Amino acid sequence: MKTILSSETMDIPDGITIKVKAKQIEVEGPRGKLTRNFKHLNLDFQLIKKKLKIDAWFGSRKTTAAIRTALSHVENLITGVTKGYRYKMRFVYAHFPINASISGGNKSIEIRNFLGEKKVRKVDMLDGVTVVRSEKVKDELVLDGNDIELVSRSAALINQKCHVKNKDIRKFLDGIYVSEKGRI
Amino acid sequence: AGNKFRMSLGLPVAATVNCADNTGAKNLYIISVKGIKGRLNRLPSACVGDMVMATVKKGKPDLRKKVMPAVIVRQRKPWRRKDGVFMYFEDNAGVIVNPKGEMKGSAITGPIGKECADLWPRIASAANAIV
Amino acid sequence: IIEPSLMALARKYNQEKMICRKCYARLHPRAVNCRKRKCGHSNQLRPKKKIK
RNA sequence: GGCUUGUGGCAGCCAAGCGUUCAUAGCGACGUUGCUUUUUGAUCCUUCGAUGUCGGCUCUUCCUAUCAUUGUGAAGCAGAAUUCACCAAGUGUUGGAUUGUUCACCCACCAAUAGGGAACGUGAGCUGGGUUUAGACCGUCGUGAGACAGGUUAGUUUUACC
RNA sequence: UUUUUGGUAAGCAGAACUGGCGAUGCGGGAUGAACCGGAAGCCGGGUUACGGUGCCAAACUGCGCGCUAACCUAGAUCCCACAAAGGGUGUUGGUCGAUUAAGACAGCAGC
Numbered sequence: 257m258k259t260i261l262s263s264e265t266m267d268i269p270d271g272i273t274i275k276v277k278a279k280q281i282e283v284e285g286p287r288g289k290l291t292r293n294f295k296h297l298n299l300d301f302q303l304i305k306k307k308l309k310i311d312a313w314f315g316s317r318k319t320t321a322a323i324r325t326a327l328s329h330v331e332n333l334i335t336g337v338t339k340g341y342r343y344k345m346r347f348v349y350a351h352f353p354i355n356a357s358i359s360g361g362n363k364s365i366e367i368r369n370f371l372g373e374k375k376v377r378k379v380d381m382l383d384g385v386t387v388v389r390s391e392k393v394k395d396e397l398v399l400d401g402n403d404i405e406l407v408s409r410s411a412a413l414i415n416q417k418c419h420v421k422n423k424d425i426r427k428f429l430d431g432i433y434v435s436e437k438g439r440i
Numbered sequence: 441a442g443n444k445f446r447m448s449l450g451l452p453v454a455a456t457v458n459c460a461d462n463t464g465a466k467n468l469y470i471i472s473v474k475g476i477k478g479r480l481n482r483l484p485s486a487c488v489g490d491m492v493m494a495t496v497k498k499g500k501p502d503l504r505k506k507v508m509p510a511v512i513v514r515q516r517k518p519w520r521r522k523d524g525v526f527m528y529f530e531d532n533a534g535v536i537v538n539p540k541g542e543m544k545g546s547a548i549t550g551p552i553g554k555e556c557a558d559l560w561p562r563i564a565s566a567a568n569a570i571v
Numbered sequence: 572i573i574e575p576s577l578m579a580l581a582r583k584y585n586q587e588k589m590i591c592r593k594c595y596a597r598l599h600p601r602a603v604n605c606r607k608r609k610c611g612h613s614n615q616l617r618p619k620k621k622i623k
Numbered sequence: 624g625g626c627u628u629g630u631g632g633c634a635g636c637c638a639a640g641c642g643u644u645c646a647u648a649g650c651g652a653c654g655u656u657g658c659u660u661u662u663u664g665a666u667c668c669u670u671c672g673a674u675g676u677c678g679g680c681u682c683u684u685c686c687u688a689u690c691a692u693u694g695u696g697a698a699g700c701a702g703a704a705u706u707c708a709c710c711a712a713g714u715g716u717u718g719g720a721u722u723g724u725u726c727a728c729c730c731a732c733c734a735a736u737a738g739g740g741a742a743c744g745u746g747a748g749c750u751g752g753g754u755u756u757a758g759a760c761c762g763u764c765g766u767g768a769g770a771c772a773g774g775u776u777a778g779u780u781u782u783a784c785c
Numbered sequence: 786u787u788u789u790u791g792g793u794a795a796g797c798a799g800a801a802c803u804g805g806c807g808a809u810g811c812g813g814g815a816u817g818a819a820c821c822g823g824a825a826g827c828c829g830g831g832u833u834a835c836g837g838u839g840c841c842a843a844a845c846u847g848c849g850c851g852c853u854a855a856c857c858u859a860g861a862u863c864c865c866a867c868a869a870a871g872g873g874u875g876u877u878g879g880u881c882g883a884u885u886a887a888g889a890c891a892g893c894a895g896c
């Protein structure tokens with residue numbers, strides 16, 4: 257059962273310069289510029305004027321599922337260049353304090369003393385992502401950037417770098433976890 | 441600190457060495473060597489400082505027909521010191537200990553190799569001359 | 572000792588999970604089917620056991 | 624070797640119950656569905672103008688239904704140890720007493736001492752302890768000659784240059 | 786093929802009716818005594834049977850509709866060279882019932 261036409265629309269803010277050509281969307285705002293390649297989607301992107309219209313013709317239920325995904329990605333780009341994204345992480349430990357060392361212009365972090373281990377864990381932030389230790393809150397990291405995927409993925413790298421092993425993780429709750437998914 | 445370097449192995453299984461302590465045993469019959477992972481057809485062998493499992497073939501009846509650990513203190517097979525000198529003793533000897541390396545006896549007859557003394561402080565305490 | 576707020580955050584990742592009875596995969600608490608292909612996307616799920 | 628798989632071995636489904644509580648952490652009664660050809664049978668298709676018939680030794684390669692080693696999930700996983708499961712055959716899997724043994728059993732070491740295939744791998748590669756010619760002894764059986772998937776001891780292992 | 790006895794079963798053993806092989810090539814089934822087609826003097830032309838028409842390889846990458854996506858070597862043609870119970874919020878059809886503009890469902894809000 258292929259529906260003849262499935263379409264969804266979104267409103268482009270007033271202070272955003274959106275450029276679309278051959279499923280190559282470029283969004284420019286006060287914070288910077290973001291671009292995503294949507295050539296892998298068999299959809300029809302159109303700017304009508306400002307609004308963005310995405311249509312799928314004679315697409316199966318799987319094909320039409322990408323319509324909302326495309327709009328959400330475009331919406332994230334608009335929010336990235338307007339408000340930005342801010343992910344907050346909290347150190348969790350029972351006995352050994354977790355020591356963090358920001359270096360390289362807030363583009364890198366080193367974790368020491370995780371569960372008393374002498375190994376040093378080094379994580380490099382992705383492009384456009386900066387990590388800063390919060391001062392208002394105790395043992396809190398703040399990651400900021402424009403691309404949600406890069407900021408969120410940077411937080412995931414830190415979280416997975418500090419997994420406890422050979423222990424009951426239910427009791428050994430040590431680690432660095434994302435506590436807030438917000439925007440600047 | 442550091443660990444002991446490899447030495448020439450001169451005492452394979454079935455080797456019978458003199459007992460250098462005063463426990464009453466007169467010889468030790470090697471049946472296995474600790475730490476040997478082995479190779480097909482390869483007899484386990486021990487050197488000075490190695491702990492081995494042995495039986496007393498001649499001595500007090502209380503010590504015979506029993507398996508006990510022992511440490512080699514002298515060997516006749518020459519081995520190379522790091523300074524390039526090859527050393528060897530006039531005979532093969534060992535002392536009966538417990539699994540923790542504590543001597544069963546209280547005195548040692550004759551000299552003992554320096555390699556064995558470093559690994560086993562209890563044996564070195566009861567030694568006369570450490571060469 | 573861990574703060575009650577922080578340990579609640581930690582258990583969101585290590586405790587609040589569903590376990591597949593066929594492949595033991597860790598699934599989100601609201602999971603109804605396992606995402607693994609080896610078990611055939613089994614719907615036989617159990618909560619991850621807590622400490623008593 | 625081939626067909627078959629009763630038997631042997633390995634695996635799944637249902638959930639009565641066990642598990643202090645609690646069907647499903649770990650187990651699975653009563654039933655029921657399969658896989659495998661490393662068991663033994665069934666058959667008698669190939670070979671009786673002959674495919675050298677036990678085991679060990681030696682040597683290579685292959686399999687995974689994983690004993691140890693690398694990375695992980697689960698637990699009635701505090702730690703330590705252990706158990707269940709996943710990807711995984713890259714590397715390793717030993718020294719001995721007794722027995723011709725295969726099998727087994729014990730001592731000891733080890734990270735571990737997993738299981739199998741290759742004409743039940745491998746005798747113009749060995750060995751010949753056993754089995755399985757002729758000598759000989761015992762026991763039982765037979766009137767006897769002799770018989771015994773009973774015991775015992777001695778018994779020629781050929782040829783490559785195609 | 787079918788009826789049929791013994792056997793867990795067997796490319797096992799034994800009967801019933803017919804055909805076939807053996808005694809027989811030829812086309813198809815990659816390959817095969819028995820399956821499918823078909824039986825034959827030596828030749829030319831024409832047309833077919835079974836089976837085929839992406840290449841191997843003679844004949845369409847012919848004209849149409851749908852289904853499938855296999856990160857297990859997806860699957861691919863009588864005999865025939867295998868696979869089961871049991872499962873999937875994979876996807877596609879269908880059957881029965883329930884709810885909904887008097888406002889359902891999800892979320893949100895204070896029934």
Ligand SMILES: [K+]
Pocket residue numbers: 476477478717732733
């Ligand atoms: K060993």
Ligand SMILES: [K+]
Pocket residue numbers: 628
């Ligand atoms: K069977």
Ligand SMILES: [K+]
Pocket residue numbers: 670671673
């Ligand atoms: K024969």
Ligand SMILES: [K+]
Pocket residue numbers: 747
């Ligand atoms: K030969």
Ligand SMILES: [K+]
Pocket residue numbers: 777
């Ligand atoms: K003789």
Ligand SMILES: [K+]
Pocket residue numbers: none
């Ligand atoms: K279905």
Ligand SMILES: [Mg+2]
Pocket residue numbers: 422423
């Ligand atoms: Mg532990």
Ligand SMILES: [Mg+2]
Pocket residue numbers: 480481
């Ligand atoms: Mg050997």
Ligand SMILES: [Mg+2]
Pocket residue numbers: none
């Ligand atoms: Mg049963």
Ligand SMILES: [Mg+2]
Pocket residue numbers: none
């Ligand atoms: Mg012949």
Ligand SMILES: [Mg+2]
Pocket residue numbers: none
């Ligand atoms: Mg011959």
Ligand SMILES: [Mg+2]
Pocket residue numbers: 674
């Ligand atoms: Mg031959």
Ligand SMILES: [Mg+2]
Pocket residue numbers: none
């Ligand atoms: Mg496997």
Ligand SMILES: [Mg+2]
Pocket residue numbers: none
């Ligand atoms: Mg415990």
Ligand SMILES: [Mg+2]
Pocket residue numbers: 712
């Ligand atoms: Mg291997």
Ligand SMILES: [Mg+2]
Pocket residue numbers: none
């Ligand atoms: Mg012997």
